Each structure stands twice: as C-alpha cells, then as structure tokens.
Amino acid sequence: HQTRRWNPKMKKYIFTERNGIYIIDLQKTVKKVDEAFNFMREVASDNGTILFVGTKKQAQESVRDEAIRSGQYFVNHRWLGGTLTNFETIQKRIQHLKKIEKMEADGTFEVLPKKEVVLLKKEQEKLERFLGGIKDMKGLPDALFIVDPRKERIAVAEARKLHIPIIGIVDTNCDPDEIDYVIPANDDAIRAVKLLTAKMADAIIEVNQ
C-alpha cells in the first residue's frame, strides 16, 4: 500500500518509490509465479484438493468464479474459526445442511405449522451463506490460497497449526513468513487478483486433466 503501513520484512521485493506509494519489482514476481505454477501443478494431480479463501470483495467474486470453473473447494464469506481444526463440528453442521435440504426438497415441504418461514428458512439461508464450498469438502485441504494474508490471520494460523502448505499473494503490508511460499502482488485491485487466481486454477486444471 502506502509507504507508512508496510512490513520491513519485505524490503527485498520493493523497487524504487513513486510519489505516494512503493513500487514492487516485477521480475521477482514473474519468477515467483512461475514457481507457484510449478508447485500447483506438482500438487494438483494427487486426487486431493486446493482450497480458495476469498477474504476481500475482489477476492470474493474472483475465487467464487475460479472455483466454480475449476470445480474446486472454496470459502467466500466470513471465515468462521475452526473449520480446519474443529472439522468434526463443521462436518456435523454440513450434514445438518444436507439433511434439511433433502427433507425440504423431497419429503413434504410442509411439516405441520406455519413455522417454516419464521426460523427454518432464515437459518438455512444464513448457514448456506456461511458454509458454501464446505458442503463438498470430503477431507482435509492440501494447499490453501489466500488473497490478502494480513486480512485473513485466522485461516493462515489454522493452516499453520495443522502444517499444510499455503500459497497466497502478499502485498507490501504483510509478513511473508507465515505463508510458506509467496508471490508479491497487490491484493487491492480487482484486475490483478482475477489474473492470478485464474492462472492458479488453469495450472491446476492443466496438471490434473
């Protein structure tokens, strides 16, 4: 971002300074994204999965579209804590979701009273909003993808405690050590996030097809 709120642990990746903000060197970025494409290719063809975490709005739409295109698993709304550690409780909740959806779609669509609208629809809508792509996550994600690491501390902490690789774009205002494998990019403009996430999904598809 600006030259005030920045992390000195990323002075390697800054290059000169325009009037107002820092300027990121691009050659390091192209080397990093080539390496990231290679690693995503190495990891995708394993009958596993790759998780997408859309913290900010740009990330929201971008990761939703890219995951749907690639058929992967993603989280889009607020990341409720404990998905990668309380996975028992999360899977209980998603089993609840599947059962209620099945019964509402098949059985009767009318239990007994006029009490479906008051709670039994609003809570289902809210839970479907929060969970989203977890309804298909069979096991444990192999490599998270985060747009803004400093705006998603809970997810990176939960992944690092379970010790699974992390890939993500680190702006100048983040510490590039919590994420084990980094690409320096601006996570504030909708254009760049789309390009990077689409490249990651394309690499996954090309390797795993």
Partner RNA sequence: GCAUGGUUGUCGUCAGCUCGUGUCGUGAGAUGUUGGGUUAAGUCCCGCAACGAGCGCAACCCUUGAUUUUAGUUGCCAGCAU
Q: For RNA, give the closer residue by CB, 154 or 198.
A: 154
When CB distances are held under 5 to 8 angstroms depending on the partner's kind, the choice from RNA, Mg ion, none that residue 171 binds is: Mg ion
Least distance in angstroms from the C-beta of 158 to RNA: 5
* Contact flags string 169-188 toward Mg ion, x per CB under 5 A: --x---------------xx
When CB distances are held under 5 to 8 angstroms depending on the partner's kind, the choice from Mg ion, RNA, none that residue 98 binds is: none
Q: For RNA, give the closer residue by CB, 71 or 82.
A: 82
How many residues touch Mg ion (CB under 5 A)?
Answer: 3
When CB distances are held under 5 to 8 angstroms depending on the partner's kind, the choice from Mg ion, RNA, none that residue 93 binds is: RNA
Least distance in angstroms from the C-beta of 185 to Mg ion: 9
Least distance in angstroms from the C-beta of 1 to Mg ion: 5
Q: For Mg ion, give the closer residue by CB, 175 or 188.
A: 188
Binding residues (CB under 7 A) for RNA: these are 78, 80-82, 85-86, 88-90, 93, 122-123, 126-127, 154, 157-158, 161
Q: What's the 3-state SS for the chain?
A: CECCCCCHHHCCCEEEEECCEEEECCHHHHHHHHHHHHHHHHHHCCCCCCEEECCCHHHHHHHHHHHHHHCCEEECCCCCCCCCCCHHHHHHHHHHHHHHHHHHHHCCCCCCCCCHHHHHHHHHHHHHHHHHHHHCCCCCCCCEEECCHHHCHHHHHHHHHHCCCEEEEECCCCCCCCCCEEEECCCCCHHHHHHHHHHHHHHHHHHHC
Site residues, Mg ion (CB under 5 A): 171, 187-188
